[PDB]
Design a binder for this molecule. Structure first.
Ligand SMILES: CC(C)=CCC[C@]1(C)[C@H](CC=C(C)C)C[C@]2(CC=C(C)C)C(=O)C(CC=C(C)C)=C(O)[C@@]1(C(=O)C(C)C)C2=O
Length: 273
């Protein structure tokens, strides 16, 4: 059974989620779109291929198909747009954290250290709820990002850590409550660089984890859900690892071809000097 403290915990989390997660992306607009040595490393984009579809509120449909690597620039045509999508998502994530009392009560410095450390992770957790594993497309309201099929299909795509992460998590068929608790556990990570009240954060995280484990125990008796709590924690550990690698990937691209917005710069620690 769920204690009163646990029920209020989930409620506050769900309330924060509904108030700050624009699931239809209706407020995402004015975004940029692709025009009408260290480079070899920059080839990180390779493991990425997504077409973009924009459905007009009038019935019209714009569809974009990316180019192929053949020289230079070309592979950076989608960065501005993605930087804008990232920024929109980050704003929603920052808002999520701020409305939560457990977060508001932490020192302003720790709130920042926690947000810079978990923003990417929280964004992926939200993106997974709009991911369609049948069609391999993230349905963001009137925008859709579909994976461009190639060489070997599904098995070939799961080789990309982030993609395998999205399919695996989606396969667990989690409830809204379990997703928001995953966001909390990720947000309240006592082991982020720059955290002072690591003692309080650690205890808060354990409470969220305990609440999740109990939620699962109380509402998922099916044999298919055995070890679900542990599977979820392993996924969060994996997401943290994916976070570190993608940050390094982003910084390398940023160094050669700047695109990070001011908010992204803030979150990634870029000073502007
Ligand atoms: C449908 C989704 C998840 C859109 C936001 C995409 C990103 C904007 C961009 C997509 C890449 C291309 C080539 C179009 C890749 C990049 C890395 C940065 C590069 C410069 C290559 C990243 O690692 C991930 C990880 C997730 C994937 C599903 C591949 C993000 O979600 C981004 C992100 O910031 C999130 C956390 C909001 C990122 O910044």
């Amino acid at each position: 059974g769920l204690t009163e403290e646990q029920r209020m915990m989930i409620r506050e989390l769900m309330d924060a989620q509904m108030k700050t997660f624009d699931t239809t992306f209706s407020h995402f607009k004015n975004f940029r779109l692709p025009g009408v040595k260290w480079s070899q490393v920059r080839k990180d984009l390779c493991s990425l291929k997504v077409s973009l579809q924009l459905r007009g509120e009038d019935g019209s449909v714009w569809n974009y198909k990316p180019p192929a690597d053949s020289g230079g620039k070309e592979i950076f045509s989608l960065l501005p747009h993605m930087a804008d999508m990232s920024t929109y998502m980050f704003k929603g994530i920052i808002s999520f954290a701020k409305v939560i009392s457990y977060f508001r009560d932490l020192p302003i410095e720790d709130q920042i250290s926690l947000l810079k450390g978990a923003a990417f992770e929280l964004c992926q957790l939200r993106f997974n709820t709009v991911f369609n594993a049948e069609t391999g497309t993230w349905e963001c309201g009137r925008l859709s990002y579909c994976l461009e099929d190639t060489a070997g299909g599904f098995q070939q795509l799961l080789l990309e850590p982030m993609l395998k992460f999205h399919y695996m998590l989606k396969k667990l068929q989690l409830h809204e409550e379990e997703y928001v608790l995953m966001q909390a556990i990720s947000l309240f990570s006592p082991d982020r660089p720059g955290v002072l009240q690591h003692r309080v954060v650690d205890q808060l995280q354990e409470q969220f984890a305990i609440t999740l484990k109990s939620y699962i125990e109380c509402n998922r008796p099916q044999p298919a859900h055995r070890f679900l709590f542990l599977k979820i924690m392993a996924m969060l550990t994996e997401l943290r690892s994916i976070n570190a690698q993608h940050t390094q990937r982003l910084l390398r691209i940023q160094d050669i071809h700047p695109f990070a917005t001011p908010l992204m710069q803030e979150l990634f620690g870029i000073t502007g000097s």
